[PDB]
Amino acid sequence: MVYSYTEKKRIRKDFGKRPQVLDVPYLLSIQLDSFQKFIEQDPEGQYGLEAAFRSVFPIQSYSGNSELQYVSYRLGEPVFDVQECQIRGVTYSAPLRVKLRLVIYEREAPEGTVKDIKEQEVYMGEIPLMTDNGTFVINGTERVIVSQLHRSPGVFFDSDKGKTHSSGKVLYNARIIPYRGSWLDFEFDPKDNLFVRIDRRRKLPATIILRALNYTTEQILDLFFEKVIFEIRDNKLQMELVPERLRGETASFDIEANGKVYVEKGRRITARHIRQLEKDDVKLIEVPVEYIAGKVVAKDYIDESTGELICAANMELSLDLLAKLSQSGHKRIETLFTNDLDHGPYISETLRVDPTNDRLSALVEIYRMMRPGEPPTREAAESLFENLFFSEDRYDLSAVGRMKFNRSLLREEIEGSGILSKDDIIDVMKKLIDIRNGKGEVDDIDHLGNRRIRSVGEMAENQFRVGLVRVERAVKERLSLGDLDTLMPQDMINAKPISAAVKEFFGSSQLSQFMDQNNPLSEITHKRRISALGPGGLTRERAGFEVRDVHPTHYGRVCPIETPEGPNIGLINSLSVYAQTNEYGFLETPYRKVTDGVVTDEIHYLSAIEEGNYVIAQANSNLDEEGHFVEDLVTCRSKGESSLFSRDQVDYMDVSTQQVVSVGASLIPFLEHDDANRALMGANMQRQAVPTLRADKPLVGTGMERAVAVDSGVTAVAKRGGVVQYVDASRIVIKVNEDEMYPGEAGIDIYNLTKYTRSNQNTCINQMPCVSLGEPVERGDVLADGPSTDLGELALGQNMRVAFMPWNGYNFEDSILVSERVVQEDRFTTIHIQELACVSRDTKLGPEEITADIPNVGEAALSKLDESGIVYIGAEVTGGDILVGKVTPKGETQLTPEEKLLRAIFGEKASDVKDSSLRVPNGVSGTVIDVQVFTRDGVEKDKRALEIEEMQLKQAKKDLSEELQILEAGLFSRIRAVLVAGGVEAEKLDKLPRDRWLELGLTDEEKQNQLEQLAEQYDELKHEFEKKLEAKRRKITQGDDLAPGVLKIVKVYLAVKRRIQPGDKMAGRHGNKGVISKINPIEDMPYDENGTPVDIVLNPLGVPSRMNIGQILETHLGMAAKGIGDKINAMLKQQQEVAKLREFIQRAYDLGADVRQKVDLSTFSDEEVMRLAENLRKGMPIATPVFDGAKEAEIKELLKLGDLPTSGQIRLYDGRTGEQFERPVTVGYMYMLKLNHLVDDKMHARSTGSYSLVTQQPLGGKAQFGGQRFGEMEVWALEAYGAAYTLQEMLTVKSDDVNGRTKMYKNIVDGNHQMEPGMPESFNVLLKEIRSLGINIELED
Amino acid sequence: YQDDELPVYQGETTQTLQDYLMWQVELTPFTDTDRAIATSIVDAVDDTGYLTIQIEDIVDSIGDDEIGLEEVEAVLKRIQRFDPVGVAAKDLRDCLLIQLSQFAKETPWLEEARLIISDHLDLLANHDFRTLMRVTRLKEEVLKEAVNLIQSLDXXXXXXXXXXXXXXXXXXXXXXXXXXXXXXXXXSIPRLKINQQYAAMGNSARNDADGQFIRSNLQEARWLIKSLESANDTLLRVSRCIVEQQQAFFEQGEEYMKPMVLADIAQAVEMHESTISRVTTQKYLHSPRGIXXXXXXXXXXXXXXXXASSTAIRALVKKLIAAENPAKPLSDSKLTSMLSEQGIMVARRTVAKYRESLSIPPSNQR
Amino acid sequence: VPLDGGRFATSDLNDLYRRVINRNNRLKRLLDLAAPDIIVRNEKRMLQEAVDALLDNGRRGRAITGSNKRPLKSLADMIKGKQGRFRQNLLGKRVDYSGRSVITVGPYLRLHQCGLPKKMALELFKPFIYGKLELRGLATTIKAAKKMVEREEAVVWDILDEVIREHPVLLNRAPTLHRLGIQAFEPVLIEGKAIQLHPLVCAAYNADFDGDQMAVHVPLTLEAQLEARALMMSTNNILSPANGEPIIVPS
Amino acid sequence: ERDGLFCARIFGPVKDYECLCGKYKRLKHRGVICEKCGVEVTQTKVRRER
RNA sequence: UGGG
């Protein structure tokens, strides 16, 4: 335990205090999981290639009876690896093999085929592959794609907030949104009528859209309403009783029931009389006539004598109609309830809005009402109805639409057809009215349970589907006139829409951009990101208010801390450490089951809807040995709230406390002691850190750095470890142990470490061996460390000794002062790498050769150039020196003696060729690293291109011969065994070459078996390794693909060193970013009683205002951190015995209460104690978890172990006057960071640059020499001062005056200092732009 | 950070900078007429900056009214020094004379030889020295540092230039050979025209106006689409048909070339000559040789019944006169007889001009 | 502005002219042809939409390009900039001699002075440098003095010291609100890549030092130096014209 | 092209004082009409004026 | 994407 083979070198101290149930996962897995979902064979139809294949296929031409049947698919092996394909600048992809067969139906026969043709498929498209590090390599780029955040398809009931007409009326609408196709919306107007909006068109009533569903008015009222039974016959005039349906009522007359009084006139409507009359059983009783005039007939009743009828529905009656309907002979007439308390009259007004009760008519008004164009032909109405409404291809809800659709309606089935049925939208309408009736709740938009994310797999599947349908459109047309086509699955498929669709999506998009190469943490947080943008998207500006606010469902899924500030606030987010994604695309978070009074160790992942109903315990809570709670009242959360609950009322447990913080902010110790916004800045500034020469371990830390560094994929992870054989800077090999081995071929592990290589930000990356020799390796090891990594631990910055005071007022506001010692020690130094390219192209005048130095240039620049005009490796190029020369011929020379005389003295070219060359720009100084030049097939390479081929061939042969050497090593071992078995000549047997001629015949069995088998193995391994070496050599040298117009490409790399300077722009992880005002010498820095000056000094003024207590705690805990290491170092200066050092180390690690760290000495025997001591000589890596920290008692005790003053303050003396400062001073060690922002590129100071051809103004860009900008508020200010000439020179002469330039400059050279203003050209531009219009403007004399 | 469509904007190209001599004269402290005379001088400066017109033509073109040549001459010599080591003055002597005046003003054997070599006998000493070594009185290799110093003396101007217009062909039309057939596959093909029509079709139904705009927005757009997609498809089909006709009709790999009347290639597709000959003007061809769909359509009767036009003859004639003259024949008629021995029926009178043409040293190589 | 990669590039507003002239030549060629009235009415409508789309892009047909889509631009949007005067005129000009560096703060350089980087120098003052090089007789031709500046001889540093001594240089920040955001100070050459600003004046800029950049301008001629020295000197004006309570007060 | 946008003749000469079809190159010829077209000599800054 |  607690080994890992790295950790035995250096131990971290953890304060613990709470256990961790589950380990941190791979944490990139979900990303790869998406890729793992895109490529696989799924018979069930899961999202991937098979879903699009079964979606588009089978395909058939119209009335041609020809079908195509696709069967599965297959993927081939890439032509290159990651390294070589990244170096050559070629995209990294894989071939696509998807088989399909052609079937020709029989002519003029039912359900028959004359012949079927199954042949091999044609090569189409290229599908890239996601690297093990999680990047998509295209054109030599990292190209990390960010996941998308959007709303899930389904039904959304919205209250809209109820403010529309200002009259204070609530309006409940709803939106059914499918996955693809037209969106359907239902809305209420203040008129209290139902209206329908289809694809944001004009508002139409809900009756005209339902009328096309073949529901008659009687079926509409009978289906969508509950009619009360009423019958008036023989003057009785009685109705049925509705005690439960009728609550409140107004009685205008006495109501008696079965001869007994029931409700008196003006009687109380309270539940007393309702229950009194409800207890007794009363049949239908008579009522007065006045109650009928308020009722409305539901169904359509006709007289039995004659055929005519009265209207349809939604029409009241009169006292004169009772004679007609009573004389007609109708015994019973069903009428709707006509009672408004919770319910109310609806849909009646909508019936009154439109005349059309019929499918044909309503189809006409919906057709012509939608499309402004050609009126309906009665074909277009049905074609747009069936095509735009539910259909197989156009309308698909699939799993999210059907699942959320059935869940919103409380339906039992979780699946169904991909299209809506007739009763589905009717149910949406019934519940939709039920929301207005007062029953039900309004779903929130910001609620995450309805908010779904997508990944690269589903989007790439969508684009591949769009391309495959785009081809499917063209395939159907060629099958009609094709008749019999030999080898049909060959030329009938074009790969241009496929490779162009997927190559266009991966190549260019707003969700696919360059990965940040600075630090591994910026890579991890770059690969894990949430964005509301994308194809459905939320673009910007709009929809940005409530949505940006924090919602309680964001607790254990997205980190509230990390987010950019000004533009993107509330949009970009970061997932939690333990957060994962469901198969359906929903985020869940784990919990810990609690049964009875004990807490079970099993975990259960819950979603928002699942966790909302149950109760989850608070993060920090005590525990017992059996798992019982110490306190009865436990803080918990039920629904959207928090409060105390009983020990038996809590369902689950929060497990770890870090579930609410992402990986970037998980490296901030004592997060509770810093402000929320300042920690938001601290997590942002730590991602911009630039790596340096040597990474120093942080004294104050967390312990998440290990999983971040090993899971970032930057370092070298050792697989199937074993005894190390050979080590080296660029190569490390390991001999695998015999325990885990694959039978046959033997072989050992080889590792090629990545040397200095250009970045996207121009920085450098490197790897160095962490092991020496003769030590084993366990699986899951770290062989090398990438940039800003130390022994597998992630150190992205360098510690310093902080002193808090002002020093002679040199620190002002947030600024900082640095000692010269930091500059002398080389700390805070970075290296950049710049790529330079020169192209040679074939023009109209013929090819452009690169050779024969440069014309019209002295030998000064020619001495540095050779090998066809390229610089040597290791040369230092400064200034405007030409790195690569080039000659472009010009053949326009004709005749006259001046040409012959010009060619007499000089000859050769005689100035017929231009001097254009690479021409390295100024402001760049450094040496050369690598020559990347690419050449063309059959262009007769020559030059130096053969040297790199000899290097690659020598390397491939050198590292290739090792495995073979092992092959005949073991082979000669076995042959040695069989020759020693009998007739052993001892050393003489090894002295004779060629296996001593196979030891003659020896025994007969070995002569017919062992000898021929041994020679067969020798010839097989020999010729096999020679064949593989020849194929590899043929693989090294290959013609590089390039454009038909380009001839040859030259690329050379440069390196530049950058040292710390007053430009500064440093930062901490607590949100503190200063600048360097002055660099003081060591003599001027304050020193303690021992004479040790402080390295860095900060201003305390920012501590109370910015509310950062983690800084000071980091300084004191840094003192207690380094003091112990100084004790071990002081003990090692005297070469103390292993016993005393063992007692001091063991006494050092076991301190503190609890901390649940059981690591202890008296285990490692002899050495490895002195190794870890020599490792911790510099300092002790104390690790502090995020939400579990240390305390003042632990800091003071651990500090008193180092004999340091408990108050954390030490006396200091002045470095100049030497006087003692009044009051003590807090000293410490804080972790310091450098930022990519430097004054090297931020200084310009333009004098006279190039001018634009339009408006005669300078440009704005640096390098191309921008003149910055002079704005409107500046003219406002200069008008506030009242200076006419100071602004007058800047408005005209310095900008828009053509003659003011030359004449002004001429007056300045002579020293006249005369203005002589002139007329601006931009005003003339405005003049002409107005003159183009019919408006005339003219100056006056 | 891609900013959607990207800048894609007019941009106001800032390069220009053909001649800065105007900005140089603008800073020269002239009085009154010297500025106008200087502007008259700088206008006649050639792009090469070696020999510019005639000194008398300037003065005759000034509209003198006195202002004799003694002034404008001092303006010449005056600007030539402020020039980048020199400009114009022609004569081919004044360039090297001014370049050596302010360069050094000392070294071993600079001015002593430079004055006589620059003054006279230069053109006589350009080919070889020989007897001139006895005229200059120098002994053996003493002049090696002199002429060696002149070699570095060097077109006098053309230092600034700054002409980014390199004029590249790029793609255009391509052909390929394989499986025993060197047949072009029309190896361009953006497909944008094809793609745009397909893509634009989606665009027509995307107005989202509610005005329908069936009369103007819908029919006109459709017409434009038919009009541009049909025109691009017809142009691409004509270019592919002409590229295939010229491909199959003549083979580049085979030695020599076959003359094609404009009519034979026009008679293959049965199209008028002007239509195809106009298509072959600005359209080039890219194969794995050289770098035009115009030089491969050269027509000539070759003036013989036994065989090809002039391209084959011209290449052959330069391949003949290339290696020849072991001694110093310096002969064109002998090349016309050797060419006549193959049955080409060369006149041998106009043969030299053809042979001489296009950088050939003949007949001045004698 | 033809590009070598894209051959001849055409502006979005250029196609409107060839479109209106195209439909105009169609209407004129088809007019005298003596054709039915429906076709010539359709031609009048197409030309009407063409001219109306040329003058005003917004509303109406809002014609869309095939390749780049977008509404493109018409004369109404091409007036100036944003369809204001702001971008290319009315204080939209970039002038010259501007800023672009970081600001620092020393506890020296009296309140009328500011540290000017010596590398930031030698460039803004090039006209003065050439003037004094031609005045003192150390050179003759302008190109010779240009080579002397490019070779940065030690004498050029002394002459530059003579130039910068009393020559004022005015400072301004990027989001200037009140008038005190832009002032005029006396430069003093300092060794470094940044500018040292007086601390007490920083409160007038309402900024802090995180490494913020700045804007710098150099007045030319003469009267501009008198308007900078007599007005924008922070030693000349203290009381802010808002409260009347003093500013630059230490903190 | 003649009679077109930014055409020669009207709107001014394209390059320096040169004229079409190689006539009246520079300098002493100012007021004049070219043989083939109405091209005249100008500083070429008139492109904005016309 | 990022800085005030």
Author numbering:
A (entry chain C): 1 to 1341
B (entry chain M): 104 to 257, 259 to 291, 293 to 396, 398 to 413, 415 to 473
C (entry chain D): 253 to 503
D (entry chain D): 52 to 101
Paper text:
Where nucleotides were added to RPo, we obtained a structure at 3.7 Å of the initial de novo synthesizing complex (RPitc), which has density for the whole transcription bubble, the newly synthesized RNA, as well as dsDNA both upstream and downstream of the transcription bubble. In the RPitc, the transcription bubble has extended to 15 nt, in agreement with two additional nucleotides being added to the initiating −1+1 UpG di-nucleotide. T strand now is pushed further back into the channel and is stabilized by β R1269, K1262, and β′ R346. The T strand is in an expanded conformation compared to RPo. The β′ coiled-coil loop is now positioned in-between the T strand, RNA and σ54 RII. The downstream dsDNA is stabilized by residues from β′ switch 1 region (1325–1328), β′ clamp (residues 207–212), β′ trigger loop/helix (1145–1150), and β′ jaw domain (residues 1170–1175). We see clear density for the 4 nt RNA that base pair to the T strand. Our structure reveals that the RNA is in a post-translocation position, and the trigger loop is accordingly in an open conformation with a shorter trigger loop helix (Vassylyev et al., 2007, Wang et al., 2006). Interestingly, we observe density corresponding to σ54 RII.3 close to T strand and the newly synthesized RNA. The structure here is consistent with a role for RII.3 in stabilizing and guiding RNA toward its exit channel.
Gene transcription is a fundamental cellular process carried out by the multi-subunit RNA polymerase (RNAP), which is conserved from bacteria to humans (Cramer, 2002, Werner, 2008). The σ54, which controls stress related genes including those involved in nitrogen fixation, nutrient starvation, infection, and other cellular stresses, forms a class of its own (Buck et al., 2000, Merrick, 1993). σ54 recruits RNAP to its promoter sites via binding to the −12 and −24 consensus promoter sequences and forms a stable RPc that rarely spontaneously isomerizes to RPo. Instead, it requires ATPase activators bound remotely upstream of RPc to convert to RPo (Buck et al., 2000). In order to understand how transcription is initiated and how initial de novo synthesis is carried out, we prepared samples to capture the RPo and the RPitc state by binding σ54 R336A to a promoter (−35 to +28) with a pre-opened transcription bubble (mismatch between −10 and −1 by mutating the non-template [NT] strand) to form RPo and then adding UpG di-nucleotide as well as GTP, to allow de novo synthesis of a −1 UpGGG +3 RNA to form RPitc.
